[PDB]
UniProtKB/Swiss-Prot annotation, chain A:
<dbReference type="GO" id="GO:0003735">
    <property type="term" value="F:structural constituent of ribosome"/>
</dbReference>
<keyword id="KW-0689">Ribosomal protein</keyword>
<dbReference type="GO" id="GO:0046677">
    <property type="term" value="P:response to antibiotic"/>
</dbReference>
<dbReference type="GO" id="GO:0006412">
    <property type="term" value="P:translation"/>
</dbReference>
<comment type="subunit">
    <text>Component of the chloroplast small ribosomal subunit (SSU). Mature 70S chloroplast ribosomes of higher plants consist of a small (30S) and a large (50S) subunit. The 30S small subunit contains 1 molecule of ribosomal RNA (16S rRNA) and 24 different proteins. The 50S large subunit contains 3 rRNA molecules (23S, 5S and 4.5S rRNA) and 33 different proteins. uS5c binds directly to 16S ribosomal RNA.</text>
</comment>
Curated annotation (Swiss-Prot), chain B:
<protein>
    <recommendedName>
        <fullName>Small ribosomal subunit protein bS16c</fullName>
    </recommendedName>
</protein>
<dbReference type="InterPro" id="IPR020592">
    <property type="entry name" value="Ribosomal_bS16_CS"/>
</dbReference>
<dbReference type="GO" id="GO:0015935">
    <property type="term" value="C:small ribosomal subunit"/>
</dbReference>
<keyword id="KW-0687">Ribonucleoprotein</keyword>
<keyword id="KW-0150">Chloroplast</keyword>
Curated annotation (Swiss-Prot), chain E:
<dbReference type="GO" id="GO:0019843">
    <property type="term" value="F:rRNA binding"/>
</dbReference>
<dbReference type="InterPro" id="IPR018079">
    <property type="entry name" value="Ribosomal_uS4_CS"/>
</dbReference>
<feature type="region of interest" description="Disordered">
    <location>
        <begin position="15"/>
        <end position="43"/>
    </location>
</feature>
<dbReference type="GO" id="GO:0006412">
    <property type="term" value="P:translation"/>
</dbReference>
<dbReference type="GO" id="GO:0009507">
    <property type="term" value="C:chloroplast"/>
</dbReference>
From Swiss-Prot, chain F:
<keyword id="KW-0689">Ribosomal protein</keyword>
<dbReference type="GO" id="GO:0009507">
    <property type="term" value="C:chloroplast"/>
</dbReference>
<dbReference type="GO" id="GO:0003735">
    <property type="term" value="F:structural constituent of ribosome"/>
</dbReference>
<keyword id="KW-0699">rRNA-binding</keyword>
<keyword id="KW-0934">Plastid</keyword>
Amino acid sequence: GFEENVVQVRRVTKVVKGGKHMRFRAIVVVGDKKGQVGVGVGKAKEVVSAVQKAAVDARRNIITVPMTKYLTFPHRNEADYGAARVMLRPAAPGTGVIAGGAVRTVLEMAGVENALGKQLGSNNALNNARATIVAVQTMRQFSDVARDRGIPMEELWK
Amino acid sequence: MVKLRLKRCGRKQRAVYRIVAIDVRSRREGRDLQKVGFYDPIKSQTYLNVPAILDFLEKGAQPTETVYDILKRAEVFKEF
Amino acid sequence: MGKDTIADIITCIRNADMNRKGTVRIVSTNITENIVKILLREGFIENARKHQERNKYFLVLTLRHRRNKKGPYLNTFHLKRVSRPGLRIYSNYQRIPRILGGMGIAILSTSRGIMTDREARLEGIGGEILCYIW
Amino acid sequence: MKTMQGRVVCATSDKTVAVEVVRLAPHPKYKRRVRMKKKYQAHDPDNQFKVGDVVRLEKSRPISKTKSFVALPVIARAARKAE
Amino acid sequence: MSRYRGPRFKKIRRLGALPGLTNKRPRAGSDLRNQSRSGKRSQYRIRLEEKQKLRFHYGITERQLLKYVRIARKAKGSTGQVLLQLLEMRLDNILFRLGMAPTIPGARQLVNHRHILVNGRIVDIPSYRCKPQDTIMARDEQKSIALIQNSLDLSPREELPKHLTLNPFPYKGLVNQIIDSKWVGLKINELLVVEYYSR
Amino acid sequence: MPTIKQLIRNTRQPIRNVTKSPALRGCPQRRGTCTRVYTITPKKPNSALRKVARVRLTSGFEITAYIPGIGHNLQEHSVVLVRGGRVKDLPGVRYHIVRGTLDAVGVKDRQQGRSKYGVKKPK
RNA sequence: GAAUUUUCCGCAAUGGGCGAAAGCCUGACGGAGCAAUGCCGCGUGGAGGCAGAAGGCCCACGGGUCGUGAACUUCUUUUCCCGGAGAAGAAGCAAUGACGGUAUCCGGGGAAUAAGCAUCGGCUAACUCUGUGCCAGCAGCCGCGGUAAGACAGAGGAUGCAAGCGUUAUCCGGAAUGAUUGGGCGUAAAGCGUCUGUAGGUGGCUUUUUAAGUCCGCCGUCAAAUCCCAGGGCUCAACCCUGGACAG
């Protein structure tokens, strides 16, 4: 029971001496609004078959988003994947999802209803939709920072 | 010289009337060096700060018609 | 050379955790010994001790790593200097940075001594912001 | 009154000394220190202070249009270039 | 124009959801089609059609709504909910939920023709914000009209919203407190409308 | 980023700025008399007979202007009023003509755009 | 010149000049007039009404749509109009006003007097049929037109906004495309051909001291009015206003 939506249907064509043929590509993102996303890129001859294969690749690369709070992000994070750079900042329980055309499509599925961002560098829908995934994977919460951090011998509780 | 009265800030029918501490050689509604208190005509709002008055009047300040009457309407300026 | 000894420790620990090493040896100075003290009180490292190589005094700095994975999670993800030599940053009681919303801290040298992000707010003092650890 | 310190660069003037005041101040838009140096024409009726001496300048009565400052004390001796 | 005049149930159709511009009309849209599968609406279409649903329900303009969403953004508290606070406090909307008028466009005419009294004094303005503990009642002269009598004859049986309390005999309704999220029964997502104004 | 100490020496600041259409001291519209009303051919993708007229402005400059719509009545002594907009198909033409003002008449039997082209309301 | 107004009324109110006063002078000013120049509010109708009437547009002509839209019916009538009352801005103080047939209030006719503009290929939210047919024309950019082009011209319909709409001009934003917060220089624009070196920038480690920078607190000033927070008054709002905050 996951929600499915398309980002961009790109037209990629190569010319041979045998004519002009194309293999359509589509980016589909999945989600259940509880804090679970997954992007998928699939290439096929037709438009309907390119959306189908990208939906099967989306439910395979499943990553958990550690948001769980009052419909917002835990902290500030800046990640750069290639030429594309996206900045994700937390917001108050009244702001909408003021993020990019390829960024808002992955954030509405993550459960984050309150978020503010910017689209820097390259404005390609392929490199920016995956740059937000690398930025959401490196997200830490108050409990897992202290568990990642190796504190010395403190007083042990039962 | 310096004197006491009221300026204009509220235009049209609503004449609010400002505070005072201005010279005679200046404007009707211009520069004011110090603040005191004011009154609103069609309301029960009457301020007029008493520690600011009498402290300004001792050093050559002239009490003109409009600052008067609103002075005796309150508990200040009587045989006390 | 050594233009800033407060900047090379930041580089020596950052490159050491990326290639997962056990012990690093940095130069011995009183101000840098004060930074490694408020690093272990928060828990970013194990401990710090005194050492000597060849008539030169060095400081032992043992790092801490998490559980075993494909690439084990590091204690300090990023280490960067704010008050770089030739661009000295100074802040008051209100201009003190809130790093990661309370998760990470920023170590600053104040007039009362050497305080952190939470410690400088309780005393009501400010100063030169050295670096930020998270 | 304001007090500013500086070194004397020129002494070849009748009862007047050229004092160069160095002042370090951070930029409000940026962060780093920008050094500004302006020379003041100080008064010295006793012609005691020569070239190379670092003196402090206080505000006083204008003896001319360019001169308004006087040199009252002396913190250190000659700190100039060798002949 | 202050309040849209002309075709009312054209916007109850097309949009999918059914608001209260009149009483109750069919689910289906305009033209010969629209009863089948519609085309894929873009990401900017969901932000444009959702704000036009909130703008038409109350019978408010774009110039007046622009102020009620900006002052609510500058004010403290949850922005998404305080848009529906200053919009529900209007004298033309609190009159619909009172049972004195069958719909909202007919409730603006009721306030404009001097039929409603607020705390004893007479108010003509529909865009007037009604603060708590206020008595929204009818006038003694306009108590004998057949339109006001017919609308309040159907009200003693139906249940009115929890933030309001109507007394059927003296024809007066009091407003106790502010309306919250679970108290609103409209088919509108308040997070899609606040995202439109900040493009 | 260019280093902080070079930003005090040089200090980055923009230019004097070049205008797209020199309509004097920030004036929206400008008046002028037409000198020569001729016909010219477009660029490479288009091929038509477009009507362009050389307008002598109030400042003393003689720049070209495009006439919109079907049919006009501009002579050698017509006092016209310019707009200020490029066509990007005809080289040198950076201005447009506002019809329905002064000597420039509006387009006959046009029912669509009446705000532009300068057409009146038909009864 | 693209473009910016009544050669009006008054001292009544506030203020200025003079006078122990009265009072006089006062297009400062208080008001009115012209102009949708902008901001704000209201209005030009409300409910009910057919099995979806004429008449248009599309049509596979079996219909659909414009359309509840209209007509037809009950209903209310702000504002405009007409008539009668009538707060306050006057404190002074033979009771003193320009504005005023003022605000506002009561009543009487009757919906009766009141909407348009742009757009509809994509970004841009909204469709087809004709005519024309790279012809005439469109156009912010990519671009449309050489016979069936939703991007020309008209019509039907739809969308947006509103007495405003559209166009143009101009600054900022989008341009982390000068980036201090925010960018780069092997090949995309970019290390000067290579050294020495003055000014300038930066500078290892220890202790003491200074403490100038810096930091804490406090005292001045940072005019008022904007902006912001909370709270009041014109029926709301615009507007006006108290205190505070801020003035880095």
